[PDB]
């Protein structure tokens, strides 16, 4: 039995921080209901990061209509 509540982590913010390892990373767009990349610097603030496009697919990339 495996449950999935609303996106939540999907809608979580791209937060880069003050940087340490600056990379492209990928997070679910809140408004746009997409999965886009964000600048992930690696510290400060939120860490909503999906590093695998397929992992965001799991989660949520495109809940469309």
């Amino acid at each position: 039995a495996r449950p999935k509540d609303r996106p939540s982590y999907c809608n979580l913010p791209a937060d880069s921080g003050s940087g340490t390892k600056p990379e492209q990373r990928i997070y679910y767009n809140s408004a746009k209901k997409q999965c886009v990349t964000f600048t992930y610097n690696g510290k400060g603030g939120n860490g909503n990061n999906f590093s695998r496009t397929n992992d965001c697919r799991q989660t949520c990339q495109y809940p469309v209509g």
Side-chain angles (χ1 to χ4, degrees):
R2 294 176 182 126
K4 295 196 171 296
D5 303 288
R6 302 72 55 209
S8 306
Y9 295 143
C10 304
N11 297 29
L12 293 187
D15 291 77
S16 61
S18 54
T20 290
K21 296 300 174 181
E23 295 177 68
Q24 295 83 268
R25 296 300 186 116
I26 307 159
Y27 69 92
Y28 171 91
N29 300 85
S30 306
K32 306 192 179 183
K33 300 211 157 185
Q34 298 178 330
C35 186
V36 303
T37 54
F38 68 108
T39 306
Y40 183 106
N41 295 150
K43 307 192 73 180
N46 305 276
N48 184 30
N49 171 88
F50 305 104
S51 55
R52 296 298 181 144
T53 306
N54 299 332
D55 292 325
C56 58
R57 305 206 65 256
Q58 304 311 274
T59 294
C60 303
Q61 301 191 93
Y62 301 101
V64 294

